[PDB]
Structures are given as structure tokens and as C-alpha cells.
Amino acid sequence: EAQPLKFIAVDYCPESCTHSPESSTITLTFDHRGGSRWRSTTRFQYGTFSSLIQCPKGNTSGLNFNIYLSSLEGDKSQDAIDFEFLGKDKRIVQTNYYTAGTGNREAIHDLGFDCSDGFHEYVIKWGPDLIQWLIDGKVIRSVRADGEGFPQKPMFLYASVWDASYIDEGRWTGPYVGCDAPYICLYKNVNVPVGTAVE
Numbered sequence: 001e002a003q004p005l006k007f008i009a010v011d012y013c014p015e016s017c018t019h020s021p022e023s024s025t026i027t028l029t030f031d032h033r034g035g036s037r038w039r040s041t042t043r044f045q046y047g048t049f050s051s052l053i054q055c056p057k058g059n060t061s062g063l064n065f066n067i068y069l070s071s072l073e074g075d076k077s078q079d080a081i082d083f084e085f086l087g088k089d090k091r092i093v094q095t096n097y098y099t100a101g102t103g104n105r106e107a108i109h110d111l112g113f114d115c116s117d118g119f120h121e122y123v124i125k126w127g128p129d130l131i132q133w134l135i136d137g138k139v140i141r142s143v144r145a146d147g148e149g150f151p152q153k154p155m156f157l158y159a160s161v162w163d164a165s166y167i168d169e170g171r172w173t174g175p176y177v178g179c180d181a182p183y184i185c186l187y188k189n190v191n192v193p194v195g196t197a198v199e
């Protein structure tokens with residue numbers, strides 16, 4: 001039971017987030033002023049979360065564009081579940097999840113397409129003992145609760161575009177080249193659970 005996410009908050013640089021409710025589209029732009037981050041206004045306790053996403057065109061080296069759940073962005077003891085595109089390679093996506101601030105569960109998935117070629121569908125199914133990530137209707141990763149932590153705090157839905165080139169000496173997302181700015185990441189038909197908003 002899903003519904004469109006129409007009520008959002010923008011955490012910084014609102015001049016780089018657009019929302020067109022009539023087209024069910026939210027855009028994030030990265031350029032010399034940085035990027036931006038949107039989120040739901042409510043947290044949720046489990047459920048299915050989805051969006052169509054078309055990633056930015058051109059040489060996206062250095063950038064991270066994403067969609068994720070987190071209990072609170074910036075909290076050092078967060079729970080979170082992520083899809084993160086690594087801009088040096090638009091034919092992969094990274095998944096990860098955090099439990100009381102501990103991540104280190106990265107996995108790299110080959111998309112089979114360029115994530116900027118059009119809209120593709122990304123889904124996170126979050127339950128108390130099972131998390132699944134889906135791309136274009138196919139499960140790409142499943143994980144189960146196992147005593148070494150599981151995301152359980154209520155979480156917001158978030159998405160951002162940011163320059164991650166400073167992380168790990170550029171090895172994670174690449175150096176930021178910037179030659180094709182502005183970089184525009186499009187989120188369409190963002191859906192959140194009907195019954196699980198908390199509060």
C-alpha cells in the first residue's frame with residue numbers, strides 16, 4: 001500500500017532542488033554551488049519505498065547521487081539503508097546499511113545499463129528481519145537480521161547529490177572533474193508507505 005511523496009523538506013540549498021508536483025518530479029542539481037538534499041517530512045517504521053531515478057548526464061566523476069533511508073542525517077549512531085551511485089562508474093550502484101552508526105556492508109552491483117540513460121526503478125523493502133533492494137523489478141540484494149545489527153529505528157526517506165571526491169583520496173567516487181555541470185538528477189514517482197508513518 002503505497003502513496004506519492006508530495007510533502008518534502010529540503011535540508012540545504014533549496015535553490016538546487018526543484019519540485020514539480022504536477023509531473024511527480026523532484027530534481028537535484030550539482031554545480032559550483034554544491035548540491036542539495038531532500039527528505040520526507042515524516043519518519044516511517046518499515047515498508048516499501050520507491051522512485052524512478054535518472055542520474056545526471058556526462059562525466060559524473062567524484063559525485064555521489066543516491067536514495068536512502070536514515071534515522072537522521074548527520075547522526076553518528078544512525079540506522080540507514082542506501083542506494084549510492086558512484087559517479088566515476090555509472091554502470092554500477094553501491095548498496096549498504098548502517099546499524100547504530102556502523103556500516104561496512106557495501107556491495108557493488110552491475111546495473112546492466114547506464115544509470116543516466118533514462119528513468120529506472122529503485123526500490124527498498126525494509127522489514128524487521130529482511131531488507132531487499134530491487135532495480136527494475138528484480139531483487140539485487142537481500143539481507144536478514146542476524147544479531148550483528150539491523151535497521152530498526154524509524155527512518156526518513158532521503159536523497160542527495162554531493163561531491164564525495166574527497167573520500168578515500170578519490171578512490172570511492174573518483175576525482176571531481178565537473179566538466180558537464182550542471183548535473184541534474186531526476187526523481188519521479190517517489191512512493192512511500194501508506195500505513196507506517198510514525199509520530
Ligand SMILES: OC[C@H]1O[C@@H](O[C@H]2[C@H](O)[C@@H](O)[C@H](O[C@H]3[C@H](O)[C@@H](O)[C@H](O[C@H]4[C@H](O)[C@@H](O)[C@@H](O)O[C@@H]4CO)O[C@@H]3CO)O[C@@H]2CO)[C@H](O)[C@@H](O)[C@@H]1O
Pocket residue numbers: 012013033034035036037064066068070073074080081082084098158159160161162163
Ligand atoms: O554549502 C551549502 C551548505 O553545505 C552544507 O554541507 C553539506 C555538504 O556540502 C554536502 O557535501 C553534504 O552531503 C551529505 C549528503 O547531503 C548526504 O545525503 C550524505 O549522506 C550519506 C550518509 O552520511 C551516509 O552514512 C550514507 O547513508 O549515505 C548517505 C548518502 O551518500 O552525506 C553527505 C556528506 O555529509 O551535506 C552537507 C549538509 O549536511 C553546510 O552544512 C552548510 O553550512 C552549507 O550552507
Ligand SMILES: OC[C@H]1O[C@@H](O)[C@H](O)[C@@H](O)[C@@H]1O
Pocket residue numbers: 082084096103106167
Ligand atoms: O563518507 C560517507 C560514505 O562512506 C562510505 O564508506 C560508505 O560506503 C557510504 O555508505 C557513505 O556515504
